[PDB]
Structure 1
Amino acid sequence: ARGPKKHLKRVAAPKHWMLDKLTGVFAPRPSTGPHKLRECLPLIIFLRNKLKYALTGDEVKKICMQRFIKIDGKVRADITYPAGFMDVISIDKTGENFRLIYDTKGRFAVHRITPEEAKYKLCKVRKIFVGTKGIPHLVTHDARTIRYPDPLIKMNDTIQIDLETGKITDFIKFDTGNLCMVTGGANLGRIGVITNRERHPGSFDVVHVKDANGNSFATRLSNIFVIGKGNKPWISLPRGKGIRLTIAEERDKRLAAKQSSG
Structure 2
Amino acid sequence: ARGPKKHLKRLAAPHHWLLDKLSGCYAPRPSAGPHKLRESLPLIVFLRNRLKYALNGREVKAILMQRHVKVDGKVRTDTTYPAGFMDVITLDATNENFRLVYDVKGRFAVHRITDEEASYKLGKVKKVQLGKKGVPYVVTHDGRTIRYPDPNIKVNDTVKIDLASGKITDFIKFDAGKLVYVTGGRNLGRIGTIVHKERHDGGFDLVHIKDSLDNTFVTRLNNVFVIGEQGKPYISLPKGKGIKLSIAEERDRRRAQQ
TM-score for the superposition, normalised by structure 2: 0.99
- Residue matched to 2:186: 186
| 1:110 maps onto 2:117 in alignment | no
2:248 corresponds to 1:248 = yes
Residue type matched to 1:172 in 2? Answer: I
SS at match of 1:168: strand
Does the residue aligned with 1:251 lie in a helix, a strand or coil? helix
Corresponding residue number in structure 1 for 2:30: 30
How many angstroms apart in 1 are the aligned matches of 2:35 and 2:73?
17
Distance 1:127 1:165 in 2: 20
Alignment of 1:18-97 (within 5 A): 18-97=18-97
Cα pair 1:161 1:169 within 8 Å, conserved: yes
Q: Which amino acid aligns with 2:163?
A: L
User: 1:204 is matched by which residue type in structure 2?
Assistant: F
- Secondary structure at the aligned position of 2:133 is classed as coil
2:201 alignment partner AA: P
Correspondence for 2:2 = 2
Distance across 2 between alignment mates of 1:168 and 1:201 = 30
Cα deviation for residue 231 of structure 1 reads 2.2
Structure richer in strand, relative to its length? 2
Segments ≥4 residues shifted beyond 4 Å: none
Q: How many residues align?
A: 258
CA contact (8 A) 1:178 1:231 kept: no
Between the aligned partners of 2:248 and 2:94, the Cα distance in structure 1 is 40
Indicate the residue corresponding to 2:160 in structure 1: 160
Corresponding position: 1:202 with 2:231: no
Q: Which runs of 5+ in 2 are unaligned?
A: none
Q: Deviations over 1:142-191 (max 9, x none)?
A: 00001100011011100001110111111111100100011011101111
CA–CA distance in structure 1, aligned partners of residues 152 and 140 of structure 2: 15
Q: Residue deviations 1:197-238, cap 9 Å, x none? A: 001111101110000111100000101100012321111111
Listed as ranges, the gaps of 5+ residues in structure 1 are none
Deviation at 1:71, TM superposition (A): 0.9
Amino acid at match of 1:210: K
1 CA distance for matches of 2:208 and 2:148?
33
Determine the structure 2 residue equivalent to 1:131.
131
CA RMSD of the aligned region, Å? 0.7
Cα shift at 1:128: 1.0
In structure 1, what is the equivalent of residue 227 of structure 2?
227
Q: Give me the TM-score of the superposition, normalised by structure 1.
A: 0.97
- Could you tell me which amino acid in structure 1 is paired with residue 37 of structure 2? L
Identity of aligned residues (%): 71
